[PDB]
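Box S1 | Example of a co-folding query
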Amino acid sequence: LMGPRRPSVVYLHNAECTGCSESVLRAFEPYIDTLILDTLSLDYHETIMAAAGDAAEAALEQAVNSPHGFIAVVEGGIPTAANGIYGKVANHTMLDICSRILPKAQAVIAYGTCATFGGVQAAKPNPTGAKGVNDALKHLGVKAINIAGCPPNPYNLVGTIVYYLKNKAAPELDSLNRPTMFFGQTVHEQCPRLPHFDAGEFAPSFESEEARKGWCLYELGCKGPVTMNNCPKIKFNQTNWPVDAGHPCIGCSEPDFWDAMTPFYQN
Amino acid sequence: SSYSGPIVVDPVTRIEGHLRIEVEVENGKVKNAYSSSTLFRGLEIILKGRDPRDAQHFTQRTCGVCTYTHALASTRCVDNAVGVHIPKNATYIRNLVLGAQYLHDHIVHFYHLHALDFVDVTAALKADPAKAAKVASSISPRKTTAADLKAVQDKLKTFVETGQLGPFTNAYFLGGHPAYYLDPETNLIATAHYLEALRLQVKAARAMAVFGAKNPHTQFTVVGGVTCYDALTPQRIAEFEALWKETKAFVDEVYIPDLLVVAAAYKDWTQYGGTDNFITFGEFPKDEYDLNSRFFKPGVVFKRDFKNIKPFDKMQIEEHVRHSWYEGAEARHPWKGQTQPKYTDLHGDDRYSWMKAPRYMGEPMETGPLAQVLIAYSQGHPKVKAVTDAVLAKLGVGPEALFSTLGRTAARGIETAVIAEYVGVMLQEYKDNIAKGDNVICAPWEMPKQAEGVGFVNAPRGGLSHWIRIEDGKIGNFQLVVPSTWTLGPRCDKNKLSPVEASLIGTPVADAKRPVEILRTVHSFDPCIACGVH
Ligand code: SF4
Ligand code: SF4
Ligand code: F3S
Ligand SMILES: [Mg+2]
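Box S1 (continued) | Returned holo structure for iron/sulfur cluster
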């Protein structure tokens, strides 16, 4: 699957919705074909790989044991309740799979709020005991770079990988282990509606003339002021982001946001 | 003689989510099958007690492949519970984002999830690109030249000679495989278009973000309507229209001709993978409270009796747990649903999946593009009839051919083509409505303390329903019954095989170590296990 010239990436899927995998397919300049043919060697990825079953398992083993080394990208939270039973691949628990593979990686990137912080299946009452990668695997010394969001901006994944390949090290990380080059500002301080916020000009409802005129969404629940992400700067799909579509930020790059930021339409 | 014994495929790749397929084969043909979904998250448990307005944000994270669809179903569900009738423009914008979702989803499914079951990418290296270009130009109005395809070949050649096959590592076609039929030139055309589709899908998804903020996981729906006042502007509408036009051209000029050239080469696949019963909910309403106002209409068919389409009665759905990892054995209507996990391991107490087993009047029902297409055809839908007839004529087969893995794959293309054209009709109506001076996109509403609601979406994989019981203004019960749950859930308490299980009986398996024929049928249903289990 790999040896030579392109760096090997092993992409794992735990308890996930595949929205983070889909976000990578939206990669733009570079696009995902350049990424898979030129930049990287994508040596395991259940969504798009040709092999299945035993053949897929063999591809994974050969990638993880390569003397050339591999980078792991991990999507989804790790279910830990009932000894990891709620999530299995090839009849192995995801906790076991990640326990055995991730300490062998040269570097681990937790991609998406589920992998970074536990995510949607970790929201109360967390029936499957879902945990983010670094929480789950603390005891094994795993320290994944956390690229948060639900899903994250794929600009932030490619940027982190490129940095890593260039500099042979993680970029500066915040106290949640997120790169400060992407997560160093609140989405609010970057928001075009900030002048309205400053003037106390809030939309009182989505049907209101104030919402039509683009007034601030804080009274309608916007979590921009407490959320770190680069959404207003980079935007998504080269064209838009939640509050330019008229909807409040729901805080999706923050830990525990399903419980901390709810009800989503209140502040 | 041939192989007898078990085959297990775990993981089934090139699907969403975590699926284990188990089959018993006898003399090279499958005689028994189990569909085992091996991840549970429990979103229905997590929703209990929360604000109904929050449900769509959680349930959208059921799945990021069929992104938006669950936000739409929960919003339709709470809209219904609250009794709000959203403005015409919110219906148009919601419908336009959903049409864009279908085009993105089906294009990615055929190329990036299904086609490696049928295309030997490495054989493309041996192709004659001049011959290949002539074939490509004969099947499409788009002209392709030898140099066009040589560029692809040169790129693939450098990739393969590095020894780092990446996503093609251990592919079932490596070295050759008796169930792979395509000649090198057709493998090269498909491989070129796979690569092309990786960039085209960026545009198809961007179309959703023009109105819907971002893809994946849109953020423009609210109870009562949508939030995106910018979607009214001529600039955003023009941006959407340009991406839609380019996406439609790809469907018409690249995907459907490839689908037809591959189906022609694999016409033996009309003989495997059939099913008996079909359910569909209809989609693209004019009236949010009348399913029969939808461009595709709901319906139910038993035992392929399409002369007797039955009305869809939402009260005849029950979700079984006897062969699932939940407590007990009692089937439940989703307004009385229960989600009480209880794991017994594979086949412990005859249970083998985290999916429930939905049954309609006690029967297992296929849903998805083949149900939507066949039921619409049988209701006299003129656009569906015109393109399925053209497809049947091109392939030289009769309508019976549609009850198969090949037919299901073709139906996915038919509905893509039909929806790609209908998005233009919807866009024009939306434009017309704005031009009449209707600029309203959200209506006011009030939360009742007690209510029941349901929202119905026909998603790219079929009939999706979200069901809420509101108690004290909070979520008392919230149940998702999702298309892959119908199609890929396990047996019920009458031990009836689900559509995927039944469809697998009779599958030939040339090489038990590389059981591509099982993947062909399983992938034809476009499984989504995060969807099915939630
Ligand atoms: S972070 Fe969000 S988008 Fe990504 S796998 Fe989790 S639920 Fe899906
Ligand atoms: S809309 Fe949200 S992010 Fe923008 S100024 Fe208001 S509170 Fe801040
Ligand atoms: S909801 Fe998430 S995508 Fe950005 S605008 Fe808020 S952090
Ligand atoms: Mg359910």
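DSSP finds twelve helices and nine strands in chain A. Chain A has two domains: 3-182, 183-267.
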